[PDB]
Swiss-Prot record:
Annotated protein name in UniProt: Bromodomain-containing protein 1
Tissue: Highly expressed in testis.
Localisation: Nucleus; Chromosome
Function: Scaffold subunit of various histone acetyltransferase (HAT) complexes, such as the MOZ/MORF and HBO1 complexes, that acts as a regulator of hematopoiesis. Plays a key role in HBO1 complex by directing KAT7/HBO1 specificity towards histone H3 'Lys-14' acetylation (H3K14ac), thereby promoting erythroid differentiation.
Span of the entire protein shown here: 555 to 674 of 1058
Disulfide bridge map: none
Record-listed cross-link Glycyl lysine isopeptide (Lys-Gly) (interchain with G-Cter in SUMO2), residues: 41
Residues in Bromo domain copies: 9-113
Signal peptide location: none
Subunit and interaction comment: Component of some HBO1 complex composed of KAT7/HBO1, MEAF6, ING4 and BRD1/BRPF2. Component of the MOZ/MORF complex composed at least of ING5, KAT6A, KAT6B, MEAF6 and one of BRPF1, BRD1/BRPF2 and BRPF3. Interacts (via PHD-type zinc finger domain) with unmodified histone H3. Interacts (via PWWP domain) with dimethylated and trimethylated 'Lys-79' on histone H3.
Length: 121
């Protein structure tokens, strides 16, 4: 059907906007602390602490599989990156501090992307 195609054109355009947003969020992590999943060889107990790990590469694979249905789902995964870090790492650490900075700087980017998604349907 022609209806399934136009949804696919919307999903495709959602995916392209989310891709740009992802690049902007990841630029606020120049140290690349959140680039890849936490290593289970290097933190073997990590899954006893954190039940839903998340990182930018895992968000990228999902994005390119057009597995974000909307901005909310995308934001949930972004928030996981931050919230996982701020639980696992103590306050006086480079890791916790980097999440705080990514959170604050990302909110500007997520604030405008919420408007562009409401605007462009
Ligand atoms: Na903690």
């Amino acid at each position: 059907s022609m209806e399934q195609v136009a949804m696919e054109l919307r999903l495709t355009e959602l995916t392209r906007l989310l891709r740009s947003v992802l690049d902007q969020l990841q630029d606020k992590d120049p140290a690349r602390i959140f680039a890849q999943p936490v290593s289970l060889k290097e933190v073997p107990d990590y899954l006893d602490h954190i039940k839903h790990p998340m990182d930018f590469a895992t968000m990228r694979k999902r994005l390119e599989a057009q597995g974000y249905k909307n901005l909310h789902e995308f934001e949930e995964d972004f928030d996981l990156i931050i919230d996982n870090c701020m639980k696992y790492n103590a306050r006086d650490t480079v890791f916790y501090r980097a999440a705080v900075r990514l959170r604050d700087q990302g909110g500007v980017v997520l604030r405008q992307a919420r408007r562009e998604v409401d605007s462009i349907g």
